[PDB]
Amino acid sequence: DSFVIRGDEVRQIAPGQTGNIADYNYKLPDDFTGCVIAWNSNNLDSKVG
Amino acid sequence: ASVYAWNRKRISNCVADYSVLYNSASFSTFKCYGVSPTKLNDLCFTNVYA
Amino acid sequence: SALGKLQDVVNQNAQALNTLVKQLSSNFGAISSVLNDILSRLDPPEAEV
């Protein structure tokens, strides 16, 4: 499941977490089994304007 | 105030809607220990010190 | 004290029942001994604990 969020909001990607994107955009089950991936992508997903 | 002389502000005789705190995105960290953040609007307290 | 054996049976049974009932007021290391408070206070990942 791929998506792009802010740098500080990656801590919300966990079972039973509170947050803004956690409760309105993407919510994980409490019995979630697996792994999560994160890496900085500022060089590609950002512009001067 | 300074951390060595931290101010203690009592909160009493008021109705508190914690939604305006929860819906605020300016907070870098939002963490509760003994209570659920989304259940705060359903509980009655006193002895509230900020 | 002539009827001490029957009274002892009654007292032991009632006392065991009372101790069993009183054990519901111990939190056993949890925040509270009332399940309703735990349900109405915490998120499910910590409520399960």
Structure resolution, Å:
2.6
Minimum-distance CB partner of C40 among B34, B37, B43: B43
Token readout for B5 is 């002389």
Solved with: cryo-EM
At residue A23, the 3 state secondary structure works out as helix
Q: Are B41 and B7 in contact (CB under 8 A)?
A: no
Residue with tokens 């519901």: C24
CB within 8 Å: A18 and B28: no
Token readout for C46 is 């910590």
Q: How many C-beta atoms surround the C-beta of residue C47 within 10 A?
A: 15
Q: Which helix (H) or strand (E) holds C7?
A: helix C4-22
Token readout for C13 is 């049974």
Q: Are C40 and B39 in contact (CB under 8 A)?
A: yes
Residue with tokens 């003994």: B34
Sign of dihedral through CA atoms C32, C36, C42, C48?
Answer: positive
* Contacts for A36 with CB less than 8 Å, ≥ 6 apart: A10, A13, A14
Q: Chain C: list its partners (3+ Cβ pairs within 8 Å).
A: A, B
